[PDB]
């Protein structure tokens, strides 16, 4: 089938060019009809329409974004590259880039998206700290990393029943925090282990706790 | 494909002109072939005439438009070049050229096959046969263990003169020096040959003069002393 | 009953860059002399089909204005390092050129070392020239002028690269590029001229004006709204009504 | 341009219930599309050219309308249909999307469980502490967390983390958490978590004793 | 009628180095231009047909290179055997135009003329006049200055220089001084002198002979 990947930096330093790359398999770019959109969603707002390629190198940009969007495409490696200069506090979004076709004028196929926040801000790593149980319950908690997403599991994903992952609260000092909590039976305690997979790449850190009483 | 000329060297003045080109290696019929004629002005650079096609069409330069008249003898397998009226103007070497091809979808420009060239001179004065005197060698026409020897060409009209060295055996160390008006209005030049001095009187050096405006053939030998 | 209604004609200029060829005469390259030979068949069968002097007049009206002087010059300088252009003519008017094959470099490119050879080389030649010994094939028999666009006229690929830039409504490209077949049934290739190593015929694309409005069959014929008022054969398919201006077995 | 107005905001219905988006455009449209983006996942394709219903997505959704109104009806809410759809147009530039209906599942009344979790020894030995109550499984949203250390009241040095709705039992998750430093954790004794729920007729208290 | 123009007129180059010349055009030619190599006494040559593309038999080391109206031939390594004038020549507008043209010579070191003199011959004396030729072979540059002595008397008028353009093999000119006068003349003095005046000689040369 058809699939698609975003690429790009995580972080941003405010004003500094944003090089965004989707690559795409599946299907040839270079094939007629075919195209590849770029939508962006800041939090909390709706989607919104950025820019477009075809196979005929021919560009259709948004005048939201005037000066700044500039597209081009790349038939010799299957992707397709976007840059945005002059980035600013408000462009924070999550990145898609889709498939578009002539013959329907929508974006069909889409890809995971990926999370650009523009700060001007140092980049932390990962603190983890467990949760005791004392039906029980248990889970971990995270503190100052930069920025989210970040993707949690529990026993490389096999306990996956009952998880919770609670969005990250921003608090006074201007980090990033949250909790990813997990309901497991109390019999089970002291018998299956319990270890909750963190795996920050925007600051590339891999740190697993183990949970225990 | 191979082209050979046939015209005359001295042509007096407000007379037509009867140039010839007989066309080997190919038939004068080919596919995608335009005869084309082109002369070259002395001193300066070519000047395109015009050319007769393989069908017949012929095109002429817009400056001959008028004075041109190129002819395709098939029988013969040869074309012609046909100027009315010549001045001192169209004085000039005229050269033979031809264009083949395969697939044509614009024109016929590239010129593969070329000719001589006919020294053509326009004036109304006469001929005259060249004056042959060799240039013998001797004690002070050598210099260690080589001897230059030649042979004078003079008093002659028009251009050119064809020499040749024991009918083209000898053709190393030959240095022909350009032609030379000199105080009439007769052309001269001088054909020296160099050749080791200790080969002098032992073998047989002629000098061969030809001249094919006057129809005129000499035979010149040189030797020491 | 939806519609598609044609209101005028979009012209266009489709050029394929032929090469010229010189002496060649020199197992492998058995098969390479012998679609050779075709190619110059193929290329004289145009020439002379040249040499011969109202529904299209719109679209033929371009193919007098290419038989000027300079005006292939144009053209083939235009699609110097690409495959489309849009060129004002000596009539001021701007017309879209695609440049579809490059036969120009293909033989100047491959063939110059060669006959001046792989097996492999061999193949594809066959496929790039049979194009060409088509596309005269068809130009050969309708006297200058065929219908519907087929594929070699202009390849499935190449009819939505053009479409696409048509100057036309957004919608409209979504509908003519589902309906290719019917859109290349209303179409019209133009065989122009051959020379300065240019071979350029005027295709003429339909131009829908009239869309998603009400229509009727059944007096033996149809009935379109247009602009308040109601028009009059008409290729329809499913739901979509096709037509220009001038047992109702199955059940669904 | 082409600007999009979808109605309701906000629409709360029960498993079964049908449920129609509404969304009009401001000039005359031809094809209409529809979207369905679950919480954090990237959007998916529901409704393709105003009727026609896209692979992948059960016959439960259906769509109709042309010009200038188009509507999405859904036959029987799902719990799995919690989402935020939007209605996007692809017949001019520049591409616009819908405003946003996040759809809520009405659901039974449902009684948290209360949880409460000291500072590790880890985190104290960074000179932080963060105590941490658990809520998990309620309905409705409306749920007020009040910390009591020592019987007083707490304000400021709390926060609330809320999951989104769950797919399979339409049901919520609250983490507050009480954030101190490692001085003001050994001054103090006892710490209590206070939770006022619609589904509890009394505030439950669950407490502990530092060491 | 189009007109051609080529840069430069006139260049010279060692041997084995790169040479380029340019030709400039006045409307657009497309890929329609040749260029030819024209040896002295030689009829044209064809080298490039077609912009970029090579004649059957031309060395590897002739580039063409141009599209429009400007355009241009490169040698890789510059030879005794290219020493020519080349022109480029159009041909998709009639009627063809050819251009200047631009010679070539080839920079080499410095050669000394070989003076060799030869008395007039008895059957030239028959007809009642002389000349003397004063050969001077195989020399580089062409720069040379020949100025007769008859019994110490310098001649003017009656002398008559011919230069041979450069030859192909060695890069080397050659000059034959013609010095014509009459029997009357010519059996009145003794002494027959030619003056050598070159670059590579330390002091001018003279070859005379006597018995006049």
């Not at chain 1, 599946?26 to 959109?37: I, Q």
């Not at chain 1, 029943?161 to 006074?172: D, K, N």
């Not at chain 3, 075709?38 to 145009?46: D, F, P, Q, S």
């Not at chain 4, 979808?6 to 498993?15: G, I, R």
Request: charged residues 15%; glycine residues 6%; contains cysteine.
């Amino acid at each position: 089938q058809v699939t698609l990947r975003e690429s790009g930096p995580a972080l941003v330093k405010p004003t500094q060019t944003l090089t965004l790359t989707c690559t795409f398999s599946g299907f040839s770019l270079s094939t007629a009809g075919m195209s590849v959109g770029w939508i962006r969603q800041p939090p909390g707002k709706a989607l919104e329409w950025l820019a477009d390629i075809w196979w005929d190198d021919k560009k259709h940009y948004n005048p939201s974004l005037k000066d700044r969007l500039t597209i081009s495409k790349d038939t010799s490696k299957n992707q397709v590259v976007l840059k945005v200069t002059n980035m600013d506090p408000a462009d924070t979004a999550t990145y898609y880039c889709a498939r578009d076709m002539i013959f329907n004028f929508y974006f069909d196929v889409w890809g995971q998206g990926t999370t650009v926040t523009v700060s001007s801000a140092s980049t932390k790593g990962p603190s983890v700290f467990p949760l005791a149980p004392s039906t029980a319950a248990l889970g971990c908690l995270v503190k100052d990393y930069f920025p989210e997403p970040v993707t949690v599991s529990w026993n490389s994903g096999a306990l996956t029943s009952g998880v919770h992952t609670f969005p990250a609260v921003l608090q006074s000092s201007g980090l990033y925090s949250l909790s990813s909590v997990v309901t497991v039976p109390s019999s089970s305690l002291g018998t299956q282990t319990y270890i909750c997979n963190v795996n920050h790449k925007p600051s590339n850190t891999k740190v697993d706790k183990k949970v225990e009483p | 494909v191979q082209l050979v000329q046939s015209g005359p060297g001295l042509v007096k003045p407000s007379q037509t002109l009867a140039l010839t080109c007989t066309v080997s290696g190919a038939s004068i019929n080919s596919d995608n072939y335009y005869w084309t004629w082109i002369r070259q002005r002395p001193g300066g650079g070519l000047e395109w005439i015009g050319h007769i096609s393989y069908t017949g069409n012929t095109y002429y330069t817009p400056s001959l438009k008028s004075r041109l008249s190129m002819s395709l003898e098939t029988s013969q397998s040869q074309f012609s070049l046909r100027l009315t009226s010549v001045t001192a103007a169209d004085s000039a070497v005229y050269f033979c050229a031809a264009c083949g091809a395969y697939v044509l979808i614009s024109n016929c420009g590239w010129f593969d096959s070329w000719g001589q060239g006919t020294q053509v001179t326009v004036s109304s004065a006469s001929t005259k046969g060249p004056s042959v005197f060799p240039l013998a060698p001797s004690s002070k026409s050598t210099s260690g263990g080589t001897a230059a020897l030649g042979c004078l060409v003079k008093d002659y009209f028009p251009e050119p003169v064809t020499v040749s060295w024991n009918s083209g055996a000898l053709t190393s160390g030959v240095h022909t020096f350009p032609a030379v008006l000199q105080s009439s209005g007769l052309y001269s030049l001088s054909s020296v040959v160099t050749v080791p001095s200790s080969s002098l009187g032992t073998q047989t050096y002629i000098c061969n003069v030809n001249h094919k405006p006057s129809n005129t053939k000499v035979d010149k030998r040189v030797e020491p002393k | 009953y939806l519609s598609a209604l044609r209101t005028g004609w979009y012209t266009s200029v489709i050029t394929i860059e032929l090469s010229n060829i010189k002496e060649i005469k020199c197992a492998k390259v058995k098969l390479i002399k012998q679609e050779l030979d075709k190619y110059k068949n193929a290329v004289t069968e145009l020439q002379l089909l040249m040499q011969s002097t109202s529904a299209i007049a719109s679209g033929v009206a371009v193919s007098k204005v290419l038989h000027l002087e300079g005006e292939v010059n144009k053209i083939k300088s235009a699609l110097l390092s690409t495959n489309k252009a849009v060129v004002s003519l000596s009539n001021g008017v701007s017309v879209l050129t695609s440049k579809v094959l490059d036969l120009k470099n293909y033989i100047d490119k491959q063939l110059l070392p060669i006959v001046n050879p792989n097996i492999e080389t061999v193949i594809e030649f066959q496929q790039k020239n049979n194009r060409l010994l088509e596309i005269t094939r068809e130009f050969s028999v309708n006297a200058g002028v065929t219908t519907p666009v087929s594929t070699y006229m202009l390849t499935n690929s190449e009819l939505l690269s053009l479409i696409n830039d048509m100057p036309i409504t957004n919608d409209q490209k979504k509908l003519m590029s589902n309906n290719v077949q019917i859109v290349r049934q209303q179409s019209y290739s133009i065989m122009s001229i051959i020379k300065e190593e240019v071979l350029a015929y005027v295709v003429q694309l339909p131009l829908y004006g009239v869309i998603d409005t009400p229509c009727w069959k059944l007096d033996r014929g149809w009935y379109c709204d247009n602009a308040g008022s109601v028009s009059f054969t008409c290729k329809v398919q499913s739901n979509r009504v096709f037509c220009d201006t001038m047992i109702t077995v199955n059940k669904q | 341009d082409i600007q999009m107005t979808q109605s309701p905001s906000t629409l709360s219905a029960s498993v079964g219930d049908r449920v129609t988006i509404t969304c009009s455009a401001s000039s005359r449209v031809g094809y209409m599309h529809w979207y369905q983006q679950k919480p954090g996942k990237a959007p998916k394709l529901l409704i393709y050219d105003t009727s026609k219903l896209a692979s992948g997505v059960p016959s439960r959704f259906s769509g109709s309308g042309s010009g200038t109104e188009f509507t999405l009806t859904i036959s029987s809410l799902q719990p799995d249909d919690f989402a935020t759809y939007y209605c996007f147009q692809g017949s001019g530039y520049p591409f616009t999307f819908g405003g946003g209906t996040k759809v809520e599942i009405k659901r039974t009344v449902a009684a948290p469980s209360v949880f409460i979790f000291p500072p590790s020894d880890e985190q104290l030995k960074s000179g932080t502490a963060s105590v941490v109550c658990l809520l998990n499984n309620f309905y409705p949203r409306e749920a007020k967390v009040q910390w009591k250390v020592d019987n007083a009241l707490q304000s400021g040095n709390s926060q609330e983390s809320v999951t989104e709705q769950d797919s399979k039992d339409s049901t919520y998750s609250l983490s507050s958490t009480l954030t101190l430093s490692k001085a003001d954790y050994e001054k103090h004794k006892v710490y209590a978590c206070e939770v006022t729920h619609q589904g509890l007729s009394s505030p439950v208290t669950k407490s502990f004793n530092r060491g």
